[PDB]
From Swiss-Prot:
Free-text tissue specificity from the UniProt record: Expressed in kidney, skeletal muscles, liver, lung, breast, intestine, placenta and skin mainly in epithelial cells (at protein level).
Family: Belongs to the LAP (LRR and PDZ) protein family.
This protein's encoding gene: SCRIB
Modified residues (Phosphoserine): 23, 87
Source domain of life: Eukaryota
Shown chain mapped onto the complete sequence: 860 to 951 of 1655
Domain PDZ: 10-98
Associated disorder: Neural tube defects: Congenital malformations of the central nervous system and adjacent structures related to defective neural tube closure during the first trimester of pregnancy. Failure of neural tube closure can occur at any level of the embryonic axis. Common NTD forms include anencephaly, myelomeningocele and spina bifida, which result from the failure of fusion in the cranial and spinal region of the neural tube. NTDs have a multifactorial etiology encompassing both genetic and environmental components.
Subunit-level organization: Interacts with UBE3A. Interacts with PAK1 and PAK2. Interacts (via PDZ domains) with VANGL2. Interacts (via PDZ domains) with LPP and TRIP6; the interaction is direct. Interacts (via PDZ domains) with TJP2. Interacts (via PDZ domains) with APC; may mediate APC targeting to adherens junctions of epithelial cells. Interacts (via PDZ domains) with TSHR; regulates TSHR trafficking and function. Interacts with ARHGEF7 and GIT1; interacts directly with ARHGEF7. Interacts with CTNNB1. Interacts with MAPK12. Interacts (via PDZ domains 1 and 3) with MCC. Interacts with DLG5. (Microbial infection) Interacts (via fourth PDZ domain) with tick-borne encephalitis virus RNA-directed RNA polymerase NS5; this interaction targets viral NS5 to the cell membrane periphery and nucleus and prevents STAT1 phosphorylation, and thus, the activation of the JAK-STAT signaling pathway. Interacts with HPV E6. Interacts with influenza A virus protein NS1; the interaction results in the translocation of SCRIB from the cell membrane to perinuclear puncta.
Protein name: Protein scribble homolog
Post-translational modification: Ubiquitinated; targeted for UBE3A-dependent multiubiquitination in the presence of high-risk HPV E6 proteins and degraded.
């Protein structure tokens, strides 16, 4: 029958002064990636790069935490404070929601 069970994963990439690769959207100090959503989701991803090559990153996934910090309802700038951080590693808790939700049918 039907069964919808999401799953949270971990994404690790090497940040660089040139620019990690992927971007964020939704933050309070930014545009609501999703009408009615005050969180943070991937707006862009660096193709053939780190965020992309990774595999566990896709434009849409919401960022629950960042570098061991709950940023579910964190402000845009707030969340960045962790991303913009000068660290060779960046752990992002992404939540993969099981779509398969056929509205029409």
């Amino acid at each position: 029958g039907s069964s919808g069970s999401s799953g949270r994963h971990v994404a690790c990439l090497a940040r660089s002064e040139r620019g990690l690769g992927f971007s964020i959207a939704g933050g309070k100090g930014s545009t609501p990636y999703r009408a009615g959503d005050a969180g943070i989701f991937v707006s862009r991803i660096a193709e053939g790069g780190a965020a992309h090559r990774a595999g566990t990153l896709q434009v849409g996934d919401r960022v629950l935490s960042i570098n061991g910090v709950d940023v579910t309802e964190a402000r845009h700038d707030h969340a960045v404070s962790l991303l913009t951080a000068a660290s060779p590693t960046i752990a992002l808790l992404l939540e993969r929601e099981a779509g398969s939700g056929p509205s029409s049918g």
